[PDB]
Design an enzyme around this catalytic site. Structure first.
Site, short mmCIF file in Angstrom:
data_model
loop_
_atom_site.label_atom_id
_atom_site.label_comp_id
_atom_site.label_asym_id
_atom_site.label_seq_id
_atom_site.Cartn_x
_atom_site.Cartn_y
_atom_site.Cartn_z
N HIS A 51 -6.91 11.33 4.93
CA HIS A 51 -8.23 10.98 5.41
C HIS A 51 -8.97 12.30 5.66
CE1 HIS A 51 -11.54 9.36 7.43
NE2 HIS A 51 -10.96 8.34 8.04
N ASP A 65 -4.05 6.84 -3.27
CA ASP A 65 -3.89 5.73 -2.32
C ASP A 65 -4.37 4.49 -3.08
OD1 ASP A 65 -3.73 4.01 -0.19
OD2 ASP A 65 -4.94 5.22 1.19
N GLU A 120 -11.30 0.92 -0.50
CA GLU A 120 -10.40 -0.19 -0.14
C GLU A 120 -11.21 -1.21 0.61
OE1 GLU A 120 -7.23 0.87 2.61
OE2 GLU A 120 -8.18 2.79 2.93
N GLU A 177 -7.28 -1.79 -3.35
CA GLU A 177 -7.78 -0.42 -3.14
C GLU A 177 -7.52 0.38 -4.43
OE1 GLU A 177 -5.17 2.01 -0.87
OE2 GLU A 177 -6.89 3.09 0.04
N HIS A 203 -12.03 5.74 2.73
CA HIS A 203 -12.02 7.11 3.28
C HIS A 203 -11.98 8.13 2.16
CE1 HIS A 203 -7.63 7.20 2.55
NE2 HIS A 203 -7.75 5.92 2.81
N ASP A 209 0.88 -1.19 0.00
CA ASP A 209 0.00 0.00 0.00
C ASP A 209 0.90 1.22 0.00
OD1 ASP A 209 -1.86 2.01 0.45
OD2 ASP A 209 -3.05 0.89 1.86
C1 LIG Z 1 -3.76 3.65 6.80
C2 LIG Z 1 -5.26 3.45 6.50
O1 LIG Z 1 -5.44 3.74 5.19
C3 LIG Z 1 -5.59 1.97 6.72
C4 LIG Z 1 -7.06 1.67 6.42
C5 LIG Z 1 -7.98 2.60 7.22
O2 LIG Z 1 -7.84 2.32 8.65
C6 LIG Z 1 -8.90 2.33 9.43
O3 LIG Z 1 -10.01 2.19 8.97
N1 LIG Z 1 -8.56 2.45 10.72
C7 LIG Z 1 -9.40 2.48 11.77
O4 LIG Z 1 -10.62 2.38 11.77
C8 LIG Z 1 -8.63 2.66 13.08
CL1 LIG Z 1 -9.06 1.35 14.22
C9 LIG Z 1 -7.64 4.09 6.98
O5 LIG Z 1 -8.49 4.90 7.78
C10 LIG Z 1 -9.80 5.01 7.22
C11 LIG Z 1 -6.17 4.35 7.37
C12 LIG Z 1 -5.84 5.83 7.24
C13 LIG Z 1 -6.25 6.64 6.04
O6 LIG Z 1 -6.27 6.57 8.41
C14 LIG Z 1 -4.91 6.39 8.34
C15 LIG Z 1 -4.07 7.58 7.96
C16 LIG Z 1 -2.95 7.24 7.00
C17 LIG Z 1 -1.68 6.87 7.17
C18 LIG Z 1 -1.09 6.69 8.56
C19 LIG Z 1 -0.83 6.31 6.06
CO LIG Z 2 -6.45 4.11 2.09
CO LIG Z 3 -3.89 2.77 1.14
#
Ligand SMILES: *C[C@@]1(O)CC[C@@H](OC(=O)NC(=O)CCl)[C@@H](OC)[C@@H]1[C@@]1(C)O[C@@H]1CC=C(C)C
Ligand SMILES: [Co+2]
Ligand SMILES: [Co+2]
Length: 355
Positions: A216, A139, A241, A336, A208, A128
């Site tokens: 995000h 992304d 994703e 994704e 997101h 990723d």
């Molecule tokens: C990194 C990531 O893209 C991973 C998928 C998704 O993670 C979650 O859904 N996390 C939770 O619900 C926490 Cl328990 C993405 O969030 C929707 C997440 C992302 C975009 O929030 C991180 C920020 C990005 C980076 C640290 C690379």
């Molecule tokens: Co993402």
């Molecule tokens: Co990603």
């Protein structure tokens, strides 16, 4: 010119007119054409970043093999990405660290310095990584495997992601996208090492929306039923994703943290503590609100930064994003794409001939 054998020509030198290739344009499930054209420079920036992403990942698929360390994989990938995007401070570069999460770990693992982990034949590795031009972020992610035992698990998740991409659109409810993804993903059953599984979406992972310099932007795209009926809007950009698992279908924080990112809403904070003030200046100069990792601080010549980094996390200026893993023994996969909700059509801007 033409791209070289192992890519080294920046995408902007391949398209000298400054007009980059469109992704897959799709009908949604006068005035708007004008409105679409008014943001052409924005779409063009996403397309430049997406073409870099396509060329980097094709290159990665050609050489990624068991036996390589995770550090070797990420450094080789990031080298190529920096060249193809023509890294230039905050105007063009890497949007966030290269994820290469393995096996039960689904997201947010990249090696820190000294990690001796080696990619194995039976590993399932989620690659990723993100590129951006002027803060317009791609992304996009895929899963690498070498044993054919995981093929149906990968097909399930790929089909679920494509289902969420087909369902998405202006005025579509985010909860409906989630329900659709889950129906497709759970239609798959897999057999791995003599045990059968119905593939489960990871219920606490999400897609997101994306904003300028903001990976995000605050709207989440569920991958199971039961989410919010908030609608998708014209002009928004989404990372669609999906993640499938053979375990519990829930992730928890696990292992050492590698990924960090300034809180987008935190303003200037005066700091006098010298090492903490210096590290925050390094972050503001090199990453701004884009995510970074500990390897990226090492490459800028920083050392003795871990307490300063903890201090910025404890102050709430920076947030840590630790690896997110299902139970030990489980297998997780991810696909994704980034989609643009243009006025005239939906553009799967990161679509390739690969996935
Ligand atoms: C990194 C990531 O893209 C991973 C998928 C998704 O993670 C979650 O859904 N996390 C939770 O619900 C926490 Cl328990 C993405 O969030 C929707 C997440 C992302 C975009 O929030 C991180 C920020 C990005 C980076 C640290 C690379
Ligand atoms: Co993402
Ligand atoms: Co990603």
């Amino acid at each position: 010119k033409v791209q070289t054998d192992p890519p080294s020509v920046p995408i902007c030198d391949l398209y000298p007119n400054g007009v980059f290739p469109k992704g897959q344009e799709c009908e949604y499930p006068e005035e708007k054409k004008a409105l679409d054209q008014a943001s052409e420079e924005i779409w063009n920036d996403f397309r430049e970043a997406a073409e870099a992403h396509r060329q980097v990942r094709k290159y990665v698929m050609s050489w990624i093999k068991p036996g390589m360390t995770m550090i070797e994989i990420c450094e080789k990938l990031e080298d190529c990405s920096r060249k193809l995007i023509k890294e230039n401070g905050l105007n063009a570069g890497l949007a966030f660290p290269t994820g290469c999460s393995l096996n039960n770990c689904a997201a947010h693992y990249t090696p820190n310095a000294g990690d001796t982990t080696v990619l194995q034949y039976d590993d399932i590795c989620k690659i990723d990584f993100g590129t951006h031009i002027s803060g317009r972020i791609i992304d996009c992610a895929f899963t690498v495997t070498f044993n054919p035992k995981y093929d149906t698990l990968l097909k399930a998740v790929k089909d679920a992601t494509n289902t969420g991409i087909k369902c998405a659109g202006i005025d579509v409810r985010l909860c409906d996208v989630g329900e659709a993804i889950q129906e497709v993903m759970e239609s798959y059953e897999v057999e791995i090492d003599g045990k059968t599984y119905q593939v489960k979406p990871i219920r606490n992972l999400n897609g997101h929306s994306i904003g300028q310099y903001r990976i995000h932007a605050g709207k989440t795209v569920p991958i199971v039923k039961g989410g919010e009926a908030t609608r998708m809007e014209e002009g928004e950009v989404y990372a669609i994703e999906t993640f499938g698992s053979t375990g519990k279908g829930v992730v928890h924080d696990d292992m050492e943290c590698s990924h960090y990112m300034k809180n987008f809403d935190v303003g200037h904070v005066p700091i006098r503590l010298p090492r903490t003030k210096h590290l925050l200046n390094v972050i503001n100069e090199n990453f701004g609100t884009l995510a970074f990792c500990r390897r990226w601080l090492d490459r800028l010549g920083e050392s003795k930064y871990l307490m300063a980094l903890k201090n910025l996390c404890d102050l709430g200026i920076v947030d840590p994003y630790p690896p997110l893993c299902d139970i030990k023994g489980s297998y997780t996969a991810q696909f994704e794409h980034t989609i643009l909700l243009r006025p005239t059509c939906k553009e799967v801007v990161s679509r390739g001939d690969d996935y």
